[PDB]
Amino acid sequence: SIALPAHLRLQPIYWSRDDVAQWLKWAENEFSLRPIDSNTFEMNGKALLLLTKEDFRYRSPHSGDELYELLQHILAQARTVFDLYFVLDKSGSVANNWIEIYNFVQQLAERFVSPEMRLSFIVFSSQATIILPLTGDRGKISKGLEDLKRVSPVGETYIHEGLKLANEQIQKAGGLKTSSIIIALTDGKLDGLVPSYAEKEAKISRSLGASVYAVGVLDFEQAQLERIADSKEQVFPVKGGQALKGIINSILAQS
Ligand SMILES: [Cl-]
Ligand SMILES: [Cl-]
Ligand SMILES: [Cl-]
Ligand SMILES: [K+]
């Protein structure tokens, strides 16, 4: 096992350009390597993972081979397996904004591609349905995104039913013995006692150890979403575009 600094324990695909430079500095001291110019790998972690070992050797004649192998060992290190459950409003009210919801999910799916990530897509209006059962298969995730794009919104906003399906999957996955995240996308416009249903189901989610995020669409009800999510800090606007980097970092910081 490699004992990395705490702030470098994230999977390297998430490393910034500054993280790469910090990794080099750490490796130099840890392995008594010859000094590494700080811009020897001027790129982020996604880019670093595309280089070949030959590329490492050319960039660092004195240490490139060791650095490449160190990266391979780091990639092999055990990390927190995250299950991400997207619970998506497809009620009639979002008929003209289904595109925002789909593309938001697509952008997060394209980010969370490290092998330890598994994704599930749930939609809800009057009833909830699993479009994509929890999986890490990037192929199945591609098809689930194809299916999501085709959804025709209609019906009520029974978000408690969508959360219920996420919780049922979580329970089957191990409950407290998992690292589960729920990402609910909705305007938060809940009728009748649905606010009570939804808040009860979300506390079940947390009872199972999951962390709940709410992503607001349209003129969304900020207060209602704060009561469903773990905290105000886990409510994000889909219109934030920065909002994507915010929720990604928040999720990665749960590990
Ligand atoms: Cl960067
Ligand atoms: Cl060198
Ligand atoms: Cl699978
Ligand atoms: K994908």
Author numbering: 12 to 252, 254 to 267
What did the publication describing this PDB structure actually write?
However, when the pH decreases below 7, TELSAM forms a six-subunit-per-turn helical polymer that can enable fused target proteins to co-crystallize. TELSAM reduces the entropic cost of crystal nucleation and growth by pre-freezing some degrees of freedom in the crystal lattice. Additionally, pre-ordering many thousands of copies of the target protein along the polymer results in substantial avidity to strengthen the subsequent target protein–target protein interactions that are formed when adjacent TELSAM polymers associate.
No twinning, pseudo-translation or TELSAM-polymer flipping was detected in diffraction data sets from these SUMO tag-free constructs. Pro144 in the vWa domain also interacts weakly with Asn107 in the adjacent vWa domain. The effect on crystallization of removing or retaining the purification tag was then tested. It was discovered that increasing the linker bulk and retaining the 10×His purification tag improved the diffraction resolution, likely by decreasing the number of possible vWa-domain orientations in the crystal. In the constructs reported here, retaining the 10×His tag during crystallization clearly did not block crystal formation and may have improved the crystal order by limiting the possible binding modes of the target protein to its host TELSAM polymer.
